């Protein structure tokens, strides 16, 4: 929201998936991810624009199912 | 891509021509199916040359038996079966490109778009893109120039231009689409494509009819809305081309256009640099535009356009060639717009030169000098000051103006002191000069 809705982001981008992580990703990385979600070979911020920076930085530490 | 497993060169050699004879007029589709099975066998064996030959044979059979519809779904099935071998499909499109260009027909437009749909699935920069460019250019020629296909060729060029271009073929393709874009009379997109391609220069040193053609299509684009400085810059960029190819008519008319444009451009420091650089040209003297440029460039003359339309306005009626002049001012609608653009351009020029000469000028005289009334003169005077071009203050009730900034007493006494020191230095220099000349003059 600082960069106003990620500079006019699309609806189908919600942070439900890339944040329920349990993979640290400190606020500095969060700000970097916000500023790196910027591949825009077109007009506006979209989903395909994201997926380059949205599939990049994938979340390694996992396996909470054994604990739950 | 992948290593060949089982070759069938002997099988295709002994069977394909026999299959062609068995289906000379193409009435049999079992022959098509059995070669599909054969090329599938070679495809599973990862052989490229055999599959390519089969596809070339299949389309060749469709050419000779002229089944246009069955060709459409046949090539659709071939390109969509499993995508086969990229070398083979790239080949098959190439002979399809070679064939669609020789038969005019009505549904070749359907053939062109069908292959376009087959190649637009991706794999553009990789595995042949010049075919798609040729098909789009072929579509342009078939529809004889419209807006839909001009948009299509607009949205196609970018991928291949960035990926794999040609110093002649690609730029001509760019030149052949911007003219259609200008024919559509779209200005924002045509400006965008022109400015994104003109960054690729340093090939024009060997141009024949390419840089001039590019420029002569972007002359109309710029001058359509408001451009007058870029107009003179690329009209002199087409003036230096007859320097290496000396042809008199185009050369002289280019000189007439650039001289008229460079003066007509709004006043700025850069325009002053161009007019001074243009002036003094040895080859520019033999045209009446030489007298026009010499008069209207410097020495702050009263540019009464009512007098100029007959003193130097002969280019409108009759000159040496008068072909650019008739294009500029001899036109009816756009010509009268440029006539008004000359009418005002000399008004700001007259205001500007009056600014550096006259401090306070009465309203009647200034309006008479501007060839307008009081309200029109004050309206343009307001137009200059809002642009910060001139330092003007007017008393509207009194109708009197001033151009000198109020001198602050600090710097007022400073220039007085500088004037004093200049006098003091002059006393020192004169005293040394006269005393020494006194010494020489009394050596007797």
């Amino acid at each position: 929201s600082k960069m106003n809705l990620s500079e006019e982001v699309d609806l189908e981008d919600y942070v439900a998936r890339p944040d329920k992580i349990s993979g640290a990703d400190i606020n500095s990385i969060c700000q970097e991810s916000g500023m790196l979600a910027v591949r825009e070979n077109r007009y506006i911020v979209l989903a395909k624009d994201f997926e380059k920076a949205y599939k990049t930085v994938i979340k390694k530490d996992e396996q909470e199912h054994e604990f739950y | 891509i992948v290593k060949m497993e089982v070759d069938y060169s002997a099988t295709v050699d002994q069977r394909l021509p026999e299959c062609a004879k068995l289906a000379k007029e193409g009435r049999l589709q079992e022959v098509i199916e059995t070669l599909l099975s054969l090329e599938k066998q070679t495809r599973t064996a990862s052989d490229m040359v055999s599959t390519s030959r089969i596809l070339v044979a299949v389309v060749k059979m469709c050419y000779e038996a002229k089944e246009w519809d069955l060709l459409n779904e046949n090539i659709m099935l071939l390109s969509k079966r499993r995508s086969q071998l990229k070398q083979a499909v790239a080949k098959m499109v190439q002979q399809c490109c070679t064939y669609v260009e020789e038969i005019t027909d009505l549904p070749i437009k359907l053939r062109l778009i069908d292959t376009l749909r087959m190649v637009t699935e991706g794999k553009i920069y990789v595995e042949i893109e010049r075919a798609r460019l040729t098909k789009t250019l072929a579509t342009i020629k078939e529809q004889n120039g419209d807006v839909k296909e001009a948009a299509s060729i607009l949205q196609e060029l970018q991928v291949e231009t960035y990926g794999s271009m040609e110093k002649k073929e690609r730029v001509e393709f760019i030149l052949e689409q911007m003219r259609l874009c200008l024919a559509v009379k779209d200005y924002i997109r045509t400006q965008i494509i022109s400015k994104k391609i003109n960054t690729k220069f340093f090939q024009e040193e060997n141009t024949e009819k390419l840089k001039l053609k590019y420029y002569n299509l972007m002359i109309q684009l710029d001058q359509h809305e408001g451009s007058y400085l870029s107009i003179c810059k690329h009209y002199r960029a087409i003036y230096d081309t007859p320097c290496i190819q000396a042809e008199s008519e185009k050369w002289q008319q280019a000189l007439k256009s650039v001289v008229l444009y460079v003066i007509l451009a709004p006043f700025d420091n850069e325009q002053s640099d161009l007019v001074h650089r243009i002036s003094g040209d040895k080859k520019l003297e033999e045209i009446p535009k030489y007298k026009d440029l010499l008069k209207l460039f410097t020495t702050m003359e009263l540019m009464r356009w009512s007098t100029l339309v007959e003193d130097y306005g002969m280019e409108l009626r009759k000159g040496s060639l008068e072909s650019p002049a008739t294009d500029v001012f001899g036109s009816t609608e756009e010509g009268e717009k440029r006539w008004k653009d000359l009418k005002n351009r000399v008004v700001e020029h007259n205001i500007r030169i009056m600014a550096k000469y006259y401090t306070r000028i009465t309203m009647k005289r200034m309006a008479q000098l501007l060839d307008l009334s009081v309200d029109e003169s004050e309206a343009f005077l307001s137009n200059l000051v809002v642009n910060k071009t001139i330092f003007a203050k007017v008393d509207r009730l009194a109708g009197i103006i001033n151009f000198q900034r109020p001198k602050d007493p600090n710097n007022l006494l400073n220039d007085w002191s500088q004037k004093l020191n200049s006098l003091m230095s002059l006393v020192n220099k004169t005293t040394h000069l006269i005393a020494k000349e006194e010494m020489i003059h009394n050596l007797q």
Binding site: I29, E32, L36, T56, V57 | -
Partner: protein, 67 residues
Amino acid sequence: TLMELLNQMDGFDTLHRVKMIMATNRPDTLDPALLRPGRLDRKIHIDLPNEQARLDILKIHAGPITK
């Protein structure tokens, strides 16, 4: 030294038109702080030469050979 290198290449002030190309032999022993995206944008593994690639290299190496 590693911390100074990290805070001078990423740090607070970034570089402009400057690209770093680096190579090594043990990717696992590398510090995870350096290899995070933002400092190393792309990771490329140069694999074993292909059999036809080896053929081309052999031809290149056997160019000026009397045979």
